Every structure is written in C-alpha cells, then in structure tokens.
Amino acid sequence: GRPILVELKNGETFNGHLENCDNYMNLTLREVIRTMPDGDKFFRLPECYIRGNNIKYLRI
Amino acid sequence: GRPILVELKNGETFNGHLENCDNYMNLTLREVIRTMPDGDKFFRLPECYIRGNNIKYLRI
Amino acid sequence: GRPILVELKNGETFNGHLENCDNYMNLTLREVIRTMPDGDKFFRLPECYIRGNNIKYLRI
C-alpha cells in the first residue's frame, strides 16, 4: 500500500501516499488528509514528515 | 456569501470559500486562511472540513 | 538573506523565503517548512505570517 493511514500518539491521523520510510519508521507522506481528534480535517497537505517516535500505529 | 469567516471554539478563525454545509453546520471551505489566536496565519489551505460542534460563530 | 529560519516562542521553527518584514518583526514567509518540537515537519506551506511578538529568534 502506497496510501496509508498513520495514527499519531496525539490522536491525529494522517492519510496520504507513502514517499519514504526508514528503519526507525520516520516517514514522509504526500497529498495528505489530516484528521483531528475533534473531527475537523485538513485536505491536500502537500507533504508531511512524521517521526517514528510519534506514531501509535499505521494501517495499510 | 461564498467567502465566509468561521471562528472556532478554540479561538482559531478560518477564512475561505464555502463548498458545503449540512443541517448540523458541518462545513467545507476551500482556499482557506487560518488565523491562530496568537496572530500567526497560514494561507492557501486547499480545503478544510469543520464540524458544527467546533464552531463558535460564522460571519458572512 | 531571503531564506531564513524563524524559531517561535512555542518551540516550532519556520524555514522559508522572506516576503515581508515590518518594524515590529511581523513577517511573511513563502514556501515554508514547519518543524514541530517533537520533530515532525510539514513541507511546502505556501505562505505563513508570523507576529513579532511570537518570535524567539531568527537565523539567516
């Protein structure tokens, strides 16, 4: 799966296309939908980098 | 009004063009300017979805 | 310099090309990389406005 959904420890989720990932799960997503715990969303974030340490889980 | 300004309960404002609104005031804005309570702004957010429950008021 | 790095009092940094600055250090950056204290980043923010009162320091 290039499109993945990443849930952060802070409760946010990022839904985007996987561009890079390293052995520590630091990763980059493109064309991202960011969903807040309160239900608000932001669409079409060009690119987001997420530290492996900040991730709760990832679903493909 | 297609361009509207939405002020959230968390103090942020979103200024963009109205794309959709439902009977619960869940709405979508495009080409949005987001203003933080501390004055910082982010321009040209492609699309934001805001839950009616998170809105304080809307100005047209 | 046009590319500058702005560190905010809230610990975030904004790395982008300087568009405007005023005598109070309210400024505008374009094509910006926003880095969070926890190491997550957002790339290619079209434009950000930052209030002088929110800035800790600026590096060119």
Compute, in degrees rounded to 10, the torsion defined by CA atoms B28, B30, B36, B40.
Answer: 170
Q: Report the number of distinct structural domains present in chain B.
A: 1
In DSSP notation, C39-52 reads S-EEEEEEEEEE-G
CA distance B41 to C23: 18
Report d(CA A44, CA B29) in Å as an integer: 13
Cα→Cα distances A13→A16, B28, B46, C25, C38, Å: 10, 18, 18, 34, 16
- Using CB atoms, list chains with 3+ pairs below 8 Å to chain C: A, B
Pairing mode, strands B13-21 and B3-8: antiparallel
Chain A residue at shortest CA distance from C42: A48
CB contact under 8 A, B40 and C47: no
Nearest residue in C to A52, CA atom: C40
Q: Name the DSSP letter for residue B39.
A: S
Query: Which three-class secondary structure string do you get for A15-52?
Result: EEEEEEECCCCCEEEEEEEEECCCCCEEEEEEEEEECH
- What residue numbers bound the domain in which C21 lies? 1-60
Method used to determine the 3D structure: X-ray
Rounded Cα distance between C9 and B38, Å, is 11
CA distance, residue C16 to nearest chain A CA (Å)? 15
Note the resolution in Å, 1 decimal: 2.2
Instruction: Give φ, ψ of B52 to 5 degrees.
Output: -50, -40
Nearest to C48 by CA among C36, C32, C60, C37: C32
Interface membership of B43 toward C (CB under 8 Å): yes
We report the CATH number of the domain holding residue B15 as 2.30.30.100
The answer to whether A34 and A60 have CB atoms below 8 angstroms apart is no
Contacts of B47 in chain A (CB under 8 A): 42-44
Phi and psi torsions of B25, nearest 5° = 65, 20
